[PDB]
């Protein structure tokens, strides 16, 4: 009859509630009318092609604007002293001083300074001209199309796959490991040795000459013969100019380690070697499980056989195979969990080990990328912990999982939750305690009475890596051991050079200030996990509500009876954790940024002393770096940072607006609207017009969402405005 068509019960709502909820439930296929397992699987599979189409289109546009409105070529010729251009600006509201200030990077008009690091990435892989960027944009536009073509193709009956096909896991793993991971990594190693590395050295190897240009002097033979060391005889000289055939070796596969001294980035030869190396593990690994040829494993049976006799895990993992394969919420929560972990692994390894040329010197880009991925990694983790409860409520079969490791979690759930409470309470009581204590004496003017615990455990790890600072005498920095000498030159000499670099971010110096914050982050992790698992383990029910299983993942509440039951659903527990997640990542990004902007200014001394007490954070970090930001537009002038000053205030406004939906609740607003409904009816010249949807206050759950969205958007945008401007201003 009406929108939403997928929900008839929703479509018959006379109020404005239907339009809202029609949007918020469009992707929840399992709740749609007359849903079948068949319809469920190839809706996702088709929605999957839709997502790919967006990514390729989004990436196509990036290659387009940089080629059309970005200099790039000007950037290539002097990567150190030119600012990359994202795209042009066209805004009628712009005053002349605006068009003025934003004209940068040698552009004919006002543009935006790119902080995505696409310039360094594209330059490192071998893109040298705008023409190259266009061909990529066209190719991605074409890739974006065939994704839609495949999406449309499998929605057709003559090409649609069976659910069982989707549930054949043994073969999907075998291909994804061997093909999706292995081959793609192998193919990339080819681009590196054919284009990236030779493009780095100085030769332009492209489609019209790649067929006639050897990647290596010696033939393809040495690989096939067996002697592969010949691919490492002649590496690039330390004093090598990128994009210049100066001090350029011939080797296409090395393990030098450390950084290319001019670019401060990892060697391309190391990477061409890396991907080639990992491709194999993936390639062999993608041949573990059984398919149609008579050899291979059975995942189920391996899970079945893993039962420790004599307790204490019970039935082990029996029936666990079918619980996962029949539940795509388990799979997603399992996927987000793994993806979320390596998302941070990207953030941690990309600032410590820069992969692209001239990215380490672009301090605004480095800060942005780390902060970017940590918040991305943050939200992903809350999703892995969100599809968890949904699995328990919608897809969990208690009987089929009788006394296995999964079912043993629900029967001692009070143990996991209470100790998470203890660990959270422990960390909080002392981390906050040590902080406040330190502020007291500095107020009292006696900073020599502070509790400054030296992170001696972590410093012991640093010395174990090769850092000759401190007197620890541990592996890779000791007097006699099998570890360092296993270096056998190769990685160690180039890498040990890199670790004792006082300039790079590769293993910075840490102290008492680094101790307190790491505990704050540990507090943030534990508490967030406490909230999320408690929502998961009590998703099917508690003692306050034993039949929570019968109400679904998201419901408003259970009423004011039995003392009150506000925010008792597993959905709300997620919604509460999102707050704690933002706080945690907030502390992480604060800690990363401040320690770096003090390092970049050549003044780590200020961080080492001000980070030990909380007033230092608010003043020497928050207050101190805001001056240039908040003067983006002044009652006297107008700078290029005016965008960020405005967005800074914008973020504050969205943030505070969420507070309205989180503090004030529905019954007040509904009664207010009822008076407004009366008004409109009794007002002449306005009676002629009537609404087609009954005006009602937002729902209890909707408001918690809407408020959280405001809270999260303002949270991000405010810090984004500050992270960029404060860093861009000083550089």
């Amino acid at each position: 009859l009406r929108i939403p068509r997928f929900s008839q019960g929703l479509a018959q709502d006379p109020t404005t509630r239907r339009i809202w909820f029609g949007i918020a439930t469009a992707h929840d296929f399992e709740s749609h009318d007359d849903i079948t397992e068949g319809r469920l699987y190839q809706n996702i599979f088709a929605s999957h092609f839709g997502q790919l189409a967006i990514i390729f289109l989004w990436t196509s546009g990036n290659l387009f604007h940089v080629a059309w409105q970005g200099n790039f070529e000007a950037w290539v010729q002097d990567p150190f002293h030119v600012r990359p251009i994202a795209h042009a600006i066209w805004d009628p509201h712009f005053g002349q001083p605006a068009v003025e200030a934003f004209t940068r990077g040698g552009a004919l008009g006002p543009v935006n300074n790119a902080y995505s690091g696409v310039y360094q990435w594209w330059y490192t892989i071998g893109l040298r001209t705008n023409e190259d960027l266009y061909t990529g944009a066209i190719f991605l536009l074409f890739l974006s199309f065939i994704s839609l073509l495949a999406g449309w193709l499998h929605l057709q009956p003559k090409w649609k796959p069976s659910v069982s096909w989707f549930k054949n896991a043994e073969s999907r793993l075998n291909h994804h490991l061997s093909g999706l991971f292995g081959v793609s990594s192998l193919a990339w190693a080819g681009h590196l040795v054919h284009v990236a590395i030779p493009g780095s050295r100085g030769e332009y190897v492209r489609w019209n000459n790649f067929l006639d240009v050897l990647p290596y002097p010696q033939g393809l033979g040495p690989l096939l013969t067996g002697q592969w060391n010949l691919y490492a005889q002649n590496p690039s000289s330390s004093n090598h100019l990128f994009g210049t055939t100066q001090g350029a070796g011939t080797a296409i596969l090395t393990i030098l380690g450390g950084f290319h001294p001019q670019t401060q980035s990892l060697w391309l030869t190391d990477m061409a070697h890396h991907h080639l190396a990992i491709a194999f593990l993936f390639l062999i690994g993608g041949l573990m499980y059984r398919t149609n040829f008579g050899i291979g494993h059975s995942i189920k049976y391996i899970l079945e056989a893993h039962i420790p006799p004599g307790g204490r895990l019970g039935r082990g993992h029996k029936g666990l195979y079918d619980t996962i394969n029949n539940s795509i919420h388990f799979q997603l929560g399992l996927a987000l969990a793994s993806l979320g972990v390596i998302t941070s692994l990207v953030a941690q390894h990309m600032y410590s080990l820069p992969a692209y040329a001239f990215i380490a010197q672009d301090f605004t880009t480095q800060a942005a990328l780390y902060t970017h991925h940590q918040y991305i990694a943050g939200f992903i983790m809350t999703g892995a912990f969100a599809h968890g409860p949904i699995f328990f409520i919608r897809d969990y079969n208690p009987e089929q999982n009788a006394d296995n490791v999964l079912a043993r979690m629900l029967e001692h759930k009070e143990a996991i939750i209470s100790h998470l409470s203890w660990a959270s309470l422990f960390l909080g009581f002392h981390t906050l305690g040590l902080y406040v204590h330190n502020d007291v004496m500095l107020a009292f003017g006696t900073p020599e009475k502070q509790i400054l615990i030296e992170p001696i455990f972590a410093q012991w790890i640093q010395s174990a890596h090769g850092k000759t600072s401190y007197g620890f005498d541990v592996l890779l920095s000791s007097t006699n051991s099998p570890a360092l000498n296993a270096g056998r030159s190769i990685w160690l000499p180039g890498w040990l050079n890199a670790i004792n670099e006082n300039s790079n971010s590769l293993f910075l110096t840490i102290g008492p200030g680094d101790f307190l914050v790491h505990h704050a982050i540990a507090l943030g992790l534990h508490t967030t996990t406490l909230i999320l698992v408690k929502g998961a383990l009590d998703a099917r029910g508690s003692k306050l509500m034993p039949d929570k299983k019968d109400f679904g993942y998201s419901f408003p509440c259970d009423g004011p009876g039995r003392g009150g039951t506000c925010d008792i659903s597993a959905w709300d527990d997620f919604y509460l954790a999102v707050f704690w997640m933002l706080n945690t990542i907030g502390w992480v990004t604060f800690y990363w940024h401040w320690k770096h902007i003090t390092l970049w200014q050549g003044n780590v001394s200020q961080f080492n002393e001000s980070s030990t007490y909380l007033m230092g954070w608010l003043r020497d970090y928050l207050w101190l770096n805001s001056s240039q930001l908040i003067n983006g537009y002044t009652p006297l002038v107008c700078n290029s940072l005016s965008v960020w000053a405005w967005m800074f205030l914008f973020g504050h406004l969205v943030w505070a607006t969420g507070f309205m939906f989180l503090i004030s609740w529905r019954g007040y607003w509904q009664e207010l609207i009822e008076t407004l409904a009366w008004a409109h009816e009794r007002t002449p010249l306005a009676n002629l017009i009537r609404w087609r949807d009954k005006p009602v206050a937002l729902s209890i759950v909707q408001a918690r969402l809407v408020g959280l969205v405001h809270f999260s958007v303002g949270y991000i945008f405010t810090y984004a405005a500050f992270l960029i401007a404060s860093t861009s201003g000083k550089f």
Binding site: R2, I3, I19, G22, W90, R692, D693
Partner: peptide, 26 residues
Amino acid sequence: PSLFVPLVGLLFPAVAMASLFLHVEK
């Protein structure tokens, strides 16, 4: 050139919001 397109990027909301309105009240 680029002064023709951001407005059709604003004609489009006018068109989209109108069409969607008709779709949701039907």
